[PDB]
Amino acid sequence: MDVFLMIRRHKTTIFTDAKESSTVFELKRIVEGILKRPPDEQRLYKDDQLLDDGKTLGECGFTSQTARPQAPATVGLAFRADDTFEALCIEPFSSPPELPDVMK
Amino acid sequence: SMQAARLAKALRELGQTGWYWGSMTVNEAKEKLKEAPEGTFLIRDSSHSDYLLTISVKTSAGPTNLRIEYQDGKFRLDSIICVKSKLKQFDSVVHLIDYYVQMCKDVHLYLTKPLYTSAPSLQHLCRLTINKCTGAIWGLPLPTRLKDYLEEYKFQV
Amino acid sequence: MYVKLISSDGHEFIVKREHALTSGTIKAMLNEVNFREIPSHVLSKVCMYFTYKVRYTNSSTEIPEFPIAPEIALELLMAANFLDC
Ligand SMILES: C=CCc1cc(CNC(=O)[C@H](Cc2ccc(OP(=O)(O)O)cc2)NC(=O)Cc2ccc(F)cc2)ccc1F
């Protein structure tokens, strides 16, 4: 049962997928292979909710029905800074220009 | 005249829909549509030699089918069951479908959304979205070759 | 395994290489690509398109709608044409 995700920190967005049954920790292992930071140097979030390593993505509320390939769910990512974690910070995408009047 | 140059343009548009199922049978169309929302539709080839194409659509009572004829360069709905006097004629069969879809937004024909045989190109999905916003391709801030691309498929479905 | 696609405003999208090969233009290019004319509100949607295209080609699943807001559609059309996808 596949969930399709955007893992986001600052100006970095990882597109990946996983199962409802896989764990938060297994997501951190995916992030580790891409960004080369170990799981214990990562915090993962759904909105402002810090995710426990032991929980399944389904247990955190990521569902196949709402994390689709055409509309992936966002997981926030914060990294270790020195002796603590940086605050979660996801930088927005650019904003679209104004619609031409005839398509309004 | 059958106007084969017009027919080929119409069949090219049909190839672009992503909801043309080709040699699909009536039974296969029934199975694909048996559980779809009311108004879900596709187009496929007709088993009947007097007809070019068939619309298969989910009604409240189950999938049903409606043939399209192509005569003298014009597509129209089956004139054996429709009053040929009240039948609009189209140069384009995708136009025919789009017209009835939009008229439904405003056995009876009720069409909503197509059942796709394959995921369209991102360019085509953009084209559809733009066509749902406007028909005024001529004035969009696009390079000419993209305007020509939009012109090849002007429909909202 | 993964490639990095960078928008004009400096967002980095890390996507499966196999999914990025949906674009003939990326595929002919090929681990990092810079798109000087595609901003992040376009390129993020391109990346979702890649996931959707791979999932719903040659599948038995009913193909769902791919959402495109009208405000990105013109730029998205230009990007998809440049990307050949
Ligand atoms: C303005 C128009 C009004 C309109 C009128 C009608 C009348 N429709 C028929 O009476 C068709 C006749 C037909 C049957 C097969 C067919 O397929 P093909 O062309 O391949 O032979 C084409 C037409 N009856 C069926 O569908 C019954 C059926 C269903 C499922 C199945 F599994 C096998 C048969 C339908 C909608 C409308 F809005």
Residue numbers in the entry:
A (entry chain B): 1 to 104
B (entry chain A): 30 to 135, 148 to 198
C (entry chain C): 17 to 46, 58 to 112
What does the paper say about this structure?
Indeed, ligand 13, bearing an allyl group, yielded the highest binding affinity (ITC KD = 380 nM, ΔH = –7.1 kcal/mol). Surprisingly, upon inspection of the structures we realized that the electron density for the allyl group of 13 was largely missing in the bound ligand. We postulated that this observation could be a result of steric clash forcing an unnatural binding mode, potentially resulting from pre-existing crystal contact constraints of apo SBC2 crystals preventing the soaked ligand to adopt its preferred binding mode. To test this hypothesis and aim to capture more bona fide binding interactions for 13, we decided to pursue a co-crystallization strategy next. SBC2 was co-crystallized in the presence of 13 and we successfully solved the structure. The liganded co-crystal structure had a different space group from the apo structure, which comprised of four protomers in the asymmetric unit in comparison to a single protomer for the apo crystal form. The ligand was bound in all four subunits, and in one of the protomers, we observed unusual electron density towards the opposite direction from the HT channel. Closer inspection of the omit map electron density in this region identified a covalent bond between the terminal carbon of the allyl group of the ligand and Cys111 at the EF loop. This observation was surprising and unexpected because allyl groups are not considered strong electrophiles and are not known nor used to readily react with cysteine residues, unless the thiol-allyl reaction is radically induced. Nonetheless, this serendipitous finding suggested that Cys111, which is in the flexible EF loop of the SOCS2-SH2 domain, could potentially be targeted as a reactive nucleophilic protein residue.
The Src homology 2 (SH2) domain recognizes phosphotyrosine (pY) post translational modifications in partner proteins to trigger downstream signaling. Here, we use structure-based design to target the SH2 domain of the E3 ligase suppressor of cytokine signaling 2 (SOCS2). SOCS2 can tightly bind to adaptor subunits ElonginB/C and scaffold subunit Cullin 5 and RING domain protein Rbx2, to function as substrate receptor of Cullin 5 RING E3 ligase complex CRL5SOCS2. In this work, we describe the structure-guided design, using fragment-based growing, of a pY-based covalent small-molecule binder targeting the SOCS2-SH2 domain.
